[PDB]
Each structure stands twice: as structure tokens, then as C-alpha cells.
Design a protein around this ligand. Structure first.
Ligand SMILES: Nc1ncnc2c1ncn2[C@@H]1O[C@H](COP(=O)(O)OP(=O)(O)NP(=O)(O)O)[C@@H](O)[C@H]1O
Ligand SMILES: [Mg+2]
Ligand SMILES: [Mg+2]
Length: 277
């Protein structure tokens, strides 16, 4: 019941920055899990569970997107301690985040970028469908179940309930924030999310982020350091339109020509992951 009597805590999974998520095992079925600890002091937003329970906005969002659609890691359970909250997330194995996968292999082939990007679109679409706005989409925040070839969205620590009115706060990755935020400190969930999706896509086909300085973000000019098809370039410039209203809707993104004939997760794994090449 306590916690330490249920899961067998393992090695720290972090490896790069703050945060404290260890590799756990669930005694009973020895199911692979991830124990993420969050200090109460460093908790900006708090939310009430369906039964009015003071809890971190992260636990609220996770439970709302938790169920079946494997697009996002599911919160299996949580615990509260005097100064922190412990979260038990499902942990795929083998696993590797998009960022390490990109650093290791560099720019991804378009076919593979199509399967991957598609999967996160489905996951983000799932989040909005449950009243959740991630706010921190980036290669670091997505995992790869290497056997199934399925990407899992993680870290809702900057998330927020999805609203149709403006947002005046943003505690996510700067370089992924839209020009609206940088220039006015205000944005709208869905269109900002599309902008981060634009950075991400570029990051997949170019091996790196397109912008680095507020100036570049505000100018919105996109230069390709790698051979990228015209279609993919068009989808990217489109998601990266300065004026929010000009960004494509999630439906337009998935109907976009470059987005057609996406591979299935298993096919993708079988072709781009399974092989030790
Ligand atoms: N379910 C999981 N399965 C496997 N690894 C995980 C899982 N959740 C988190 N990790 C690892 O733990 C790291 C931190 O996860 P994260 O959700 O981002 O917490 P954080 O406290 O917000 N740290 P950070 O965002 O880097 O400042 C990730 O980069 C992953 O390597
Ligand atoms: Mg993170
Ligand atoms: Mg976080």
C-alpha cells in the first residue's frame, strides 16, 4: 500500500537535466513502470481531481488522457508524500526518446518522419479530445516503443486544460513557442500547438531545430539544411505561418498531400527500427 512495497525502484532514467524519474518494476506482474517524482515547491499549477482533490495539474491532465489510446503514456497510479507527489507511468521496453534517436541517426527519412509525425498528431489530437493542451511538444517529450514502432507522448508538466480563450502564461520550451507568445505573451492552444508541431517536423527531417533566437522566430524564415521534398517543406512553412489564423488545422495537416499513405507502426518498426541498421 505505501509504495515501496509495490514497485521495485531501479536506476534513475533522467540523464540530462533536473527532474527525478526512476526505472521501476511492479511487484506482482513485474510490469515495467516509470516513477516520476515531483517536488511540491516547484509546482506552478494545481488542479482539482474529479472528486475535488488538490493535486498537480500534471496528475489531472494525465488522468483525463489516460485510458486506451496508446498515443500517450498512461498514468497507472500516483501517491502523495509530505513534500512531493509520485507518479507511476507505464514504461515501454525497449524505449528511446526522439531526441536521442535523432542525435544518433541524424535527419530521418521522410517515410519514417511521416509515420512518426502522424503518430504524434494522433496523440496530440487525442489530448485535445480529452480537454488537454500539452504545451511542450518536442522530440525530448516523445518516446519510441522500438518493438511496436509506436511513439508515446510524455511530460504534461507544462500542460493545461484546453480552453478556447487566450493563454497569457507559457512555461514550456522557448524555441518551440510561437511568434505570438514571443511578441505579445498571448496565444491560443490549438494554433500554438500547430506551431510546435511545425518545429518538430522540421527537426525530424533536418536533424535540428529551425530557430534559435527570438529574432528568427519572429521573422519566421525557414532555411533547409537538408534535402527535403517540396511537399514536406510546404507543410512545414504552413505550420510555421506567423499569423496563427494562417496555420493549418489538425485536419488540414493530416489531409495534406505529404501526409498520405502513412505507414503503420509495426511496418515502420519492421522497416526502420527492427533492423539493427
Ligand atoms: N514513461 C517513461 N518511460 C521511460 N522513460 C521515461 C518515462 N517518463 C519519463 N522518462 C524519462 O525521464 C525523463 C524526464 O521525463 P519528464 O516527464 O520530462 O520529467 P521532467 O521532471 O519534466 N524533466 P525535464 O522535462 O527534462 O526538465 C525523460 O527525458 C525520459 O528519458
Ligand atoms: Mg521533459
Ligand atoms: Mg516537466
Amino acid at each position: 500500500e505505501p509504495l515501496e512495497s509495490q514497485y521495485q525502484v531501479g536506476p534513475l532514467l533522467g540523464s540530462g537535466g533536473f527532474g527525478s524519474v526512476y526505472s521501476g518494476i511492479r511487484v506482482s506482474d513485474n510490469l515495467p513502470v516509470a516513477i516520476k517524482h515531483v517536488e511540491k515547491d516547484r509546482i506552478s499549477d494545481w488542479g482539482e481531481l474529479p472528486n475535488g482533490t488538490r493535486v498537480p495539474m500534471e496528475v489531472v491532465l494525465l488522468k483525463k488522457v489516460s485510458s486506451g489510446f496508446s498515443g500517450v503514456i498512461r498514468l497507472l497510479d500516483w501517491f502523495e508524500r509530505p513534500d512531493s507527489f509520485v507518479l507511476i507511468l507505464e514504461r515501454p521496453e525497449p524505449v528511446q526518446d526522439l531526441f536521442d534517436f535523432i542525435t544518433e541517426r541524424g535527419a530521418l527519412q521522410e517515410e519514417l518522419a511521416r509515420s512518426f509525425f502522424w503518430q504524434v498528431l494522433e496523440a496530440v489530437r487525442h489530448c485535445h479530445n480529452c480537454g488537454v493542451l500539452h504545451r511542450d511538444i518536442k522530440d525530448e517529450n516523445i518516446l519510441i516503443d522500438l518493438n511496436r514502432g509506436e511513439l508515446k507522448l510524455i511530460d504534461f508538466g507544462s500542460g493545461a486544460l484546453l480552453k478556447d480563450t487566450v493563454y497569457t502564461d507559457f512555461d514550456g520550451t522557448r524555441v518551440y513557442s510561437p511568434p505570438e507568445w514571443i511578441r505579445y505573451h498571448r496565444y491560443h492552444g490549438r494554433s500554438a500547438a500547430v506551431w510546435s508541431l511545425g518545429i518538430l517536423l522540421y527537426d525530424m527531417v533536418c536533424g535540428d531545430i529551425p530557430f534559435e533566437h527570438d529574432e528568427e522566430i519572429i521573422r519566421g524564415q525557414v532555411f533547409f539544411r537538408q534535402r527535403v521534398s517540396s511537399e514536406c517543406q510546404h507543410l512545414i512553412r504552413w505550420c510555421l505561418a506567423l499569423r496563427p489564423s494562417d496555420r493549418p488545422t489538425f485536419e488540414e495537416i493530416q489531409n495534406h498531400p505529404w501526409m498520405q499513405d502513412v505507414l503503420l507502426p509495426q511496418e515502420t518498426a519492421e522497416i526502420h527500427l527492427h533492423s539493427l541498421s
